[PDB]
UniProtKB/Swiss-Prot annotation, chain D:
Keyword Transmembrane helix part of the UniProt annotation: no
Cell location: Nucleus, Nucleolus
SMART domains cross-referenced by the UniProt entry: Ribosomal_S4 (SM01390), S4 (SM00363)
Gene Ontology CC terms, in alphabetical order: 90S preribosome; Mpp10 complex; nucleolus; nucleoplasm; small-subunit processome
Major localisation: nucleus
UniProt entry keywords in alphabetical sequence: Nucleus, Ribonucleoprotein, Ribosome biogenesis, RNA-binding, rRNA processing, rRNA-binding
Organism listed in the record: Saccharomyces cerevisiae (strain ATCC 204508 / S288c) (Baker's yeast)
One annotated GO molecular function: rRNA binding
The protein, known as: U3 small nucleolar ribonucleoprotein protein IMP3
Assembly with partners or alone: Component of a heterotrimeric complex containing IMP3, IMP4 and MPP10. Interacts with MPP10. Component of the ribosomal small subunit (SSU) processome composed of at least 40 protein subunits and snoRNA U3.
Curated annotation (Swiss-Prot), chain E:
Protein task: Required for bud-site selection and cell separation. Also involved in nucleolar processing of pre-18S ribosomal RNA.
Further comment found in the protein's record: Present with 16700 molecules/cell in log phase SD medium.
Location in or out of the cell: Nucleus, Nucleolus
UniProt gene name: PWP2
Family: Belongs to the WD repeat PWP2 family.
Subunit structure: Interacts with snoRNA U3. Interacts with MPP10. Component of the ribosomal small subunit (SSU) processome composed of at least 40 protein subunits and snoRNA U3.
Spans of repeat WD: 17-59, 60-99
Protein name: Periodic tryptophan protein 2
UniProtKB/Swiss-Prot annotation, chain F:
Family statement drawn from the similarity comment of this UniProt entry: Belongs to the MPP10 family.
Lineage: Eukaryota, Fungi, Dikarya, Ascomycota, Saccharomycotina
Portion of the full-length sequence here: 347 to 495 of 593
Location of the protein in the cell: Nucleus, Nucleolus
Subunit structure: Component of a heterotrimeric complex containing IMP3, IMP4 and MPP10. Interacts with snoRNA U3. Component of the ribosomal small subunit (SSU) processome composed of at least 40 protein subunits and snoRNA U3. Interacts with the SSU processome subunits EMG1, IMP3, IMP4, KRR1, NOC4/UTP19, NOP1, RPS4A, RPS4B, RPS6A, RPS6B, RPS7A, RPS7B, RPS9A, RPS9B, RPS14A, RPS14B, UTP1-UTP18, UTP20-UTP22 and UTP25.
Gene: MPP10
Coiled-coil region list: none
UniProt function note: Involved in nucleolar processing of pre-18S ribosomal RNA. Required for the early cleavages at sites A0, A1 and A2 during 18S ribosomal pre-RNA processing.
The name this protein goes by in its record: U3 small nucleolar RNA-associated protein MPP10
Organism domain of life: Eukaryota
From Swiss-Prot, chain G:
GO molecular function: RNA folding chaperone; rRNA primary transcript binding; single-stranded telomeric DNA binding; snoRNA binding
Subunit structure: Component of a heterotrimeric complex containing IMP3, IMP4 and MPP10. Interacts with MPP10. Component of the ribosomal small subunit (SSU) processome composed of at least 40 protein subunits and snoRNA U3.
InterPro entries: Brix (IPR007109), IMP4/RPF1 (IPR044281)
Keywords from the named record: Nucleus, Ribonucleoprotein, Ribosome biogenesis, rRNA processing
GO cellular component: 90S preribosome; Mpp10 complex; nucleolus; nucleoplasm; small-subunit processome
Effect of R193A: No effect on RNA binding
Name of the protein this chain belongs to: U3 small nucleolar ribonucleoprotein protein IMP4
Pfam families: Brix
Length: 124, 59, 46, 182, 102, 109, 282
């Protein structure tokens, strides 16, 4: 649990597979994997002491296209989990209001624009 | 500095001592002048005036 | 000669005195503020 | 254009005949007003070079942080832009994205160099003087405003000899020696 | 850099130590020494041709060395620069002599 | 009385002896404070090649924009292979020639 | 080169002011560097500024001799002029002879009717690096000032227990080989500054068997300078004393050449302060 390289590889296994034997260790990680890997590490470090209204700033997207982004992403999520919801495999478990993180989440960089959950419904 | 000493032997005895004016300008006596006897050369923090008195606090 | 001797003995005396006063200050700080904070800790339970 | 009423301004909000979104806030116009740029396409001719510098700086920061290729080319580009004068400090590599800017390339132009060297009272005066052919860098007369003056090449920005401006500054301090024509 | 016009090879390359750009040169008659001046350095760079090393950096102009020429008979160096000064250097044989003509 | 600064030290035989055996310790251990005279990966390789050609084009137009007063590239002790051939063949296409030697010296053959 | 050297010093002190101004970003970038290294949480001030981390992507590839001597430390040998005050006495001319024999790559210049502004200008356009100006008092030399010339520093010293090689005996001729150096307990940052000043006027890289050595040994702000030759025996190493010995005390160190005295002082001897004789390299 206190191995740092192992746990960093574990939680950055998704975008290494999205933007790739394979390389995982820094001093071998080429561009978009490097930028998003470093950004993910800096977010995870800064989420302890930084304020929750200041650490995860969403990109300013207009209303009628951010809502369509969210609706198409939720359609992808429902289509993916609904596809294998009946299956006996260990689908990973999410919380109640969050978005399920899928391959289009990691490739399309969708969580910078839509967040991890609708925080108006999370607040209410 | 004119008259706190009577002889260059006395100034030689007291060389290097820290003096000060009544304005608190710190200073040090450096060398006895040759021909006027108890007169010496001191160096101060900056330019002292003709209306001052230097002071060697001894015990 | 008296210049060098008097200067260095005055420096030694000052450096001893500062060590002694700082020692008694932070020994009064440490081994009595521990008891002050212990009394505050067992007074907060009331 | 007629200061729409409340129902009109509510009914057509995105209407604007002057400021568009492709305009980018009229910043070509803004910095060419600041540094007095004659032709319209100099901003975008500089913007292409700033985009080259920042494209290479992105693609070079996307290399791993310890390899000597990235470190050598980052330091080499940083040195080149400081020596040319666009960058004002060769210390940090975030200058290669943040401080590289059409205004920096425009501050290196000849009338702005002139005005900072107190050689003309304003940038428009400096434009008028080097259009009138008073200013030489080195030996040779420079005639156009857009001339970019590097750091070692700004030591030689002077007036031409037999300049009326050189004559009147010398005769203001009455150091005019008419033997060497001024 | 030096070029053999028999075998067509660049056999010698002379750089300084200061990363400057050279604007004029001058060679010896008895071609032991090449010499070159820049417009951003105020020095004159003196290289041996037999070995490749930087033999000397002559200093004394206060302006960019615009032109260099070796005298073809007595082998004295004449440089001239934008500080309104021509200067004559006796390089060879224990002199290290400088004569500035304004 | 109090005195301002310490006097200048008198240099006696004891301080010269201490200083000399300090020098002897340094000089037999050679503790001298002198001045001292001054392939990878496919993806990493093609990343290097792309930023190399970007760097080349950008340096070209920066030099032309700078009106070629620039500061040169630092140093490169490169490595050149020259085959042997007639210097007739190392020339331009014209009816004449200038030299009919071979590009390698006798001490290079 | 007047305008070039003026604007070059201007740009250097602009860059130095910008470094000390934005040197906080260096250490907080160091903080987030070691926070990536060992996965420990980042402070609130370094956690809520978004611009510094997206500059840190660029700035992750960032990383002795100091700013005046750093450009040409071992690359180029020095060039020193040694000159006296003005109308010097004969024992000061003998001492200036001895100092020009101390430093290799040093010549001596006759002083009389040389103004110090155009002397400095003649040196720093003829290409010399250091100037040593020697001051006397009825024969006994009392000061030496070292000025490093491309707008470098001047260190002004007083000299105190001066015994001269001309004064002792005909013990022979000197050696003039590139010496070895010894610096004993120069411990503070002013000590390293004075070491760099005093040792960038010797040639870089002497021979390993160079048989003369010259020591600058600090003994409570009184740098004893002696010069020795040696020959290593079967049991120890035998030291003979050659050339002048003195004690120099730094009283001033400022950041321009000799001519102005409008230069910023890095250090100068506060003599009359209350805690003057209580610390060394004060």
């Amino acid at each position: 649990q206190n191995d740092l390289e192992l746990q960093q590889f574990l939680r950055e296994s998704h975008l290494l597979s999205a933007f790739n034997g394979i390389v995982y260790q820094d001093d071998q990680v080429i561009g978009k994997a490097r930028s998003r890997t470093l950004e993910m590490r800096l977010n995870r470090l800064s989420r302890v002491n930084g304020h929750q209204d200041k650490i995860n700033k969403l990109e300013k997207v207009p209303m009628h296209i951010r809502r369509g982004m969210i609706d198409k992403h939720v359609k992808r999520i429902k289509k993916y989990e609904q596809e294998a919801a009946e299956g006996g495999i260990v689908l990973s478990k999410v919380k109640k209001g969050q978005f399920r993180k899928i391959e289009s989440t990691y490739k399309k960089d969708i969580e910078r624009r839509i967040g991890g959950s609708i925080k108006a419904r999370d607040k209410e | 500095i004119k008259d706190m000493f009577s002889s260059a032997m006395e100034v030689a005895r007291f060389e290097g001592a820290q003096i000060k004016t009544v304005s608190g300008i710190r200073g040090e006596i450096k060398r006895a002048l040759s021909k006027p006897e108890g007169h010496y050369r001191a160096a101060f923090e900056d330019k002292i005036l003709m209306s001052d008195i230097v002071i060697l606090r001894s015990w | 000669f008296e210049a060098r001797q008097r200067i260095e003995e005055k420096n030694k005396e000052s450096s001893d005195y500062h060590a002694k006063m700082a020692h008694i200050v932070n020994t009064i700080n440490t081994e009595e503020g521990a008891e002050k904070n212990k009394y505050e800790r067992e007074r907060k339970l009331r | 254009v007629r200061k729409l009423k409340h129902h009109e301004q509510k009914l057509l909000k995105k209407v604007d005949f002057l400021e568009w979104k492709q305009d980018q806030g009229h910043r070509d116009t803004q910095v060419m007003r600041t540094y007095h740029i004659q032709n319209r396409e100099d901003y975008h001719k500089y913007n292409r070079i700033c985009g080259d510098i920042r494209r290479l700086a992105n693609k070079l920061s996307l290399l791993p942080p310890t390899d000597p290729f990235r470190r050598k080319h980052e330091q080499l580009l940083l040195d080149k832009l400081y020596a040319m004068g666009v960058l004002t400090t060769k210390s940090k590599i975030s200058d290669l994205e943040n401080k590289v800017t059409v205004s920096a390339i425009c501050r290196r132009r000849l009338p702005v160099i002139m005005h900072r060297l107190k050689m003309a009272e304003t940038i428009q005066d400096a434009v008028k003087f080097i259009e009138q052919g008073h200013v030489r860098v080195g030996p040779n007369l420079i005639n156009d405003p857009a001339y970019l003056v590097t750091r070692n090449m700004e030591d030689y920005v002077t007036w031409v000899d037999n300049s009326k401006i050189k004559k009147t500054l010398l005769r203001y301090r009455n150091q005019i020696d008419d033997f060497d024509f001024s | 850099r030096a070029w053999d016009l028999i075998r067509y090879r660049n056999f010698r390359t002379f750089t300084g130590t200061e990363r400057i750009q050279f604007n004029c040169l001058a060679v010896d008659p008895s071609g032991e020494v090449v010499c070159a001046g820049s417009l951003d350095n105020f020095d004159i760079h003196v290289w041996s041709v037999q070995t490749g090393q930087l033999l000397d950096a002559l200093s004394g102009h206060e302006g960019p060395v615009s032109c260099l020429s070796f005298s073809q008979e007595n082998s004295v160096l004449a440089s001239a620069s934008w500080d309104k000064t021509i200067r004559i250097w006796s390089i060879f044989g224990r002199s290290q002599q400088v004569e500035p003509i304004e | 009385f109090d005195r301002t600064a310490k006097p200048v030290p008198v240099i006696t035989s004891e301080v010269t002896e201490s200083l000399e055996d300090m020098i002897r310790r340094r000089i037999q251990d050679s503790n001298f404070d002198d001045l001292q005279r001054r392939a990878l990966s496919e993806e990493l390789q093609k990343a290097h090649s792309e930023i190399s050609e970007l760097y080349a084009n950008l340096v070209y137009k920066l030099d032309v924009l700078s009106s070629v007063h620039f500061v040169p590239k630092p140093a490169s002790t490169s490595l050149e292979i020259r085959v042997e051939t007639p210097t007739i063949s190392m020339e331009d296409a014209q009816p004449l020639y200038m030299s009919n030697a071979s590009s390698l010296a006798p001490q290079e053959i | 080169m007047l305008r070039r050297q003026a604007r070059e010093r201007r740009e250097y002190l602009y860059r130095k002011a910008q470094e000390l101004q934005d040197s906080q970003l260096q250490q907080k970038r160091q903080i987030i560097k070691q926070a990536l290294a060992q996965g420990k949480p980042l402070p609130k001030e370094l956690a809520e500024d978004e611009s510094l981390q997206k500059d840190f992507r660029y700035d992750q590839s960032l990383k002795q001799v100091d700013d005046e001597y750093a450009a040409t430390s071992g690359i180029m040998d020095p060039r020193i002029i040694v000159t006296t005050s003005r109308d010097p006495s004969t024992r000061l001319s003998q001492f200036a002879k001895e100092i020009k024999l101390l430093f290799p790559n040093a010549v001596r210049l006759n002083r009389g009717n040389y103004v110090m502004p155009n002397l400095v200008d003649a040196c720093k356009k003829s290409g010399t690096t250091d100037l040593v100006v020697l001051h006397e008092h009825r024969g006994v030399p009392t000061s030496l000032t070292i000025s490093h010339f491309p707008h470098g520093p001047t260190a002004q010293f007083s000299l105190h227990n001066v015994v001269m090689r001309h004064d002792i005996i005909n013990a022979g001729n000197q050696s003039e080989v590139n010496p070895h150096l010894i610096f004993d307990n120069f411990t503070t940052a002013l000590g390293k500054r004075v070491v760099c000043i005093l040792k960038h006027l010797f040639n870089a890289g002497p021979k390993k068997d160079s048989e003369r050595v010259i020591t600058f040994a600090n003994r409570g702000d009184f740098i004893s300078v002696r010069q020795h030759v040696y020959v290593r025996t079967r049991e120890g190493v035998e030291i003979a004393e050659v050339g002048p010995r003195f004690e120099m005390r730094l009283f001033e160190l400022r950041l321009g050449t000799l001519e102005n005295k409008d230069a910023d002082v890095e250090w100068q001897l506060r003599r009359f302060i209350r805690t003057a004789n209580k610390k060394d390299y004060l």
